[PDB]
Structure formats: C-alpha cells, structure tokens
From a paper:
Later, proteins capable of binding and increasing the fluorescent signals of fluorogenic molecules became commonly referred to as fluorogen activating proteins (FAPs). In silico shortlisting with the further screening of the lipocalin Blc mutants launched DiBs FAPs tags family binding green and red BODIPY dyes. It suggests that the easier task of fine-tuning the fluorogen-binding properties of an already functional protein in silico should be readily achievable. To test this hypothesis, we used Rosetta for computational ligand docking followed by protein binding pocket redesign to further improve the previously described FAP DiB1 that is capable of binding to a BODIPY-like dye M739. The designed protein, DiB-RM, shows higher brightness, localization precision, and apparent photostability in protein-PAINT super-resolution imaging compared to its parental variant DiB1.
The resulting protein, designated DiB-RM, performs better than its parental variant both in vitro (except for the dissociation constant) and as a tag for protein-PAINT with higher brightness, localization precision, and apparent photostability. We speculate that the observed decrease in affinity to the ligand is caused by introducing two aromatic amino acids in the protein’s binding pocket (76F and 89Y). While the presence of these amino acids is most likely responsible for the observed increased brightness of the DiB-RM:M739 complex compared to the parental DiB1:M739 through the better protein:ligand interface packing, in the absence of the ligand these bulky amino acids might partially hinder the entrance of the ligand in the binding pocket. Crystallization analysis of DiB-RM in the apo form in different conditions further confirmed the already known high flexibility of the E/F lipocalin loop that was not properly addressed during our computational redesign. (C) The side and the top views on the overlay of the DiB1 complex (shown in yellow) with the DiB-RM apo structure (shown in light gray). The side chains of the amino acids in the positions that differ between DiB1 and DiB-RM as well as M739 are shown as sticks. Interestingly, in both cases, the 50 top-scored structures contained a mixture of different ligand positions one of which was matching the chromophore position in DiB1 while the other was very close to our original docked pose. This observation together with our inability to obtain the DiB-RM:M739 co-crystal structure might indicate that we have stabilized an alternative binding site for the ligand by the introduced mutations but have not destroyed the other one. As a result, the ligand in DiB-RM might have multiple possible binding positions. This can also explain the larger apparent dissociation constant of this new complex. Rigidifying of this loop through shortening or designed interactions can provide better stabilization of the ligand in the binding pocket.
Residue numbers in the entry: 20 to 177
The structure:
C-alpha cells in the first residue's frame, strides 16, 4: 500500500501544520527517477481552501538546461496533529509522506515515503551543521533506513 507509512516508523504526533509552511531545501534524498540528477531542489508548502496542501517541487536539470517544477497536492490521512500525509501529482494516485523527525523550531525535518526506499533530509537553509546531520543519520538508522543510499544534493554553499 503506497499511501501508508513504513512498518515500525515513528511519525511526529504534535504537528503544527501552519509552522511547516513555506520553503524547504532538500539536503539529501534516496534517489529515484523523478529526482535523479536534479540540483538545488526546494519544496514549497501552502494551505488550500479544501484543507490539503499545495506542494511545489523545484529543481535544476543540467541535461535540459532548465529549472523544472512538479505540482502536487497533499492531504492528511488522519488528524492534522499527526504528520502522516499522502501526495498526488496526477489523478487519484497518492504516495505516503511522513515527517518522522522535526526540531522544536521547525527548521530541520526528516521525511520518509511509504517504505524505507524513500527518505529526505530537509532544512530551511541550503546547508546544515555537522551536529544536525549526525542527529538525522542517527534517527534514520534507528528507524531501520539504510543511510548509505543518501545522495547529498547540490545546494549553494555545499
């Protein structure tokens, strides 16, 4: 089931959706065809009339010589105080989106998909401290993700 969280993963359960809105830089990702080779990736989150979120993915594609966007819609699968969502880019075809770690300042987030082949480190800044990087890798490995799969995404100052 590609719209539920991975078995045996803790999801953030005191989620304040309003503080999560705005722009997040992608620090690291497990690669798949949608993202592979994209640089300087951000995700931008905004509230919709219908209680879902707009998710605008932006990345630089060196082979095409262009910036490209993916326009999606995210909805909470349960209460909006549990950071368990599902995202679609076309039609009723959803993937799981789960915030599994978040600092009290809503400045750094570990986000996974519906299984352990999907994981992202995200930051309000394009670079993170070695201390924040270490905590992210510790949380991910404790939840059973193979962090050797990370691609460290090209960002200004990386």
């Amino acid at each position: 089931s590609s719209s539920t969280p991975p078995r045996g993963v803790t999801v953030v359960n005191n989620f304040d959706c309003k503080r999560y809105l705005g722009t997040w830089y992608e620090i690291a990702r497990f690669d798949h065809r949608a993202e592979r080779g994209l640089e300087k990736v951000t995700a931008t989150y905004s509230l919709r009339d219908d209680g879902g979120l707009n998710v605008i993915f932006k990345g630089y594609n060196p082979d095409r010589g262009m910036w490209q966007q993916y326009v999606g819609k995210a909805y909470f699968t349960g209460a909006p105080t549990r950071a368990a969502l599902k995202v679609a880019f076309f039609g009723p075809f959803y993937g799981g989106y789960n915030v599994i770690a978040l600092d009290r300042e809503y400045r750094h987030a570990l986000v996974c998909g519906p299984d352990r082949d999907y994981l992202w480190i995200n930051s309000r800044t394009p670079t993170i401290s070695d201390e924040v990087k270490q905590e992210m890798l510790a949380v991910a490995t404790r939840e059973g993700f193979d962090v050797s799969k990370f691609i460290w995404v090209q960002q200004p100052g990386s």
